[PDB]
């Protein structure tokens, strides 16, 4: 189906404890594939997926230079933003940036992204048109004026429409045996008495990839959104994901409840019931 590539970057200042920490990771869909941490003993961008390992030494050198250079620009920017916000050198502050591309099943660009945050709130974002900016406050307006002068939006457009889509296409092919083979969830329904008159039904989805899934309880064919406890999808740590949904039901009314599972790895959406 559709695919994505994203780079995430975080710098955190630490007054009195040396220079800011910089951490960046790269993903293809939900698969982590590269990482860099400025606090590593000898910092280099490193592989985290087997299909990226085939990239040559020139690839790793370039990626590492970019990460180091980005770490430096974020250090400068943290100092600049203290001036923009009239903040003291006493506190820890955070810069985040994410960029990347979404493509359709044909590998054509659907949407490009480039967006930033300061202390966990929107700072400046490239609009979907890839030619204009949304600046969140008066500080980000200063950045917007600088970036308009330097035609940053036009340069991001060229990157996102070109390099981003093409490298994504390359990675998808190189990693096809794992990236383009959806693992459907393994599913089961459990039953847990609370008292003599009620019980919990929990619908489980395990070992699935990608992370996107819909898990819903229905009673008599109607969605029970209000009464459903639904946990955040969570990583198993082996590149697959886990999720559950639970409802509390009257004793003996269990057959009225069906759990509905949608995931791209399933031939057909599932309808599950508790089997006594």
């Amino acid at each position: 189906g559709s695919h994505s590539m994203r780079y995430f970057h975080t710098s955190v200042s630490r007054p009195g404890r040396g220079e800011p920490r910089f951490i960046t990771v790269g993903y293809v869909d939900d698969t982590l594939f590269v990482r860099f941490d400025s606090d590593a003993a000898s910092p280099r961008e490193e592989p985290r997926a087997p299909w990226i390992e085939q990239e040559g030494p020139e690839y790793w050198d370039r990626e590492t230079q970019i990460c180091k250079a980005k770490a430096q620009t974020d250090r400068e920017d943290l100092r600049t933003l203290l001036r923009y916000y009239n903040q003291s050198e006493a506190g820890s502050h955070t810069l985040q940036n994410m960029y990347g591309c979404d493509v359709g099943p044909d590998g054509r660009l659907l949407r490009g992204y480039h967006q930033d945050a300061y202390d966990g709130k929107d700072y400046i974002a490239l609009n979907e048109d890839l030619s204009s900016w949304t600046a969140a406050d008066t500080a980000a307006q200063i950045t917007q004026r600088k970036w308009e002068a330097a035609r940053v939006a036009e340069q991001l457009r060229a990157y996102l429409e070109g390099e981003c889509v093409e490298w994504l296409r390359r990675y998808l092919e190189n990693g096809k045996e794992t990236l383009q083979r959806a693992d459907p969830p393994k599913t089961h329904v459990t039953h847990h008495p609370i008292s003599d008159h009620e019980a919990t039904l929990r619908c489980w989805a395990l070992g699935f990839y990608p992370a996107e899934i819909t898990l819903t309880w229905q009673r008599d064919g109607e969605d029970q959104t209000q009464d459903t406890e639904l946990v955040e999808t969570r990583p198993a740590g082996d590149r697959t994901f886990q999720k559950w949904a639970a409802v509390v039901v009257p004793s003996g009314e269990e057959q009225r409840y069906t759990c509905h599972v949608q995931h791209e790895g399933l031939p057909k959406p599932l309808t599950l019931r508790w089997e006594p």
Binding site: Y7, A69, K70, T73, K146, E163, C164, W167
Partner: peptide, 9 residues
């Protein structure tokens, strides 16, 4: 593959 060019805020 990452973008090479960088700009200060």
């Amino acid at each position: 593959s990452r973008r090479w060019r960088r700009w200060n805020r």
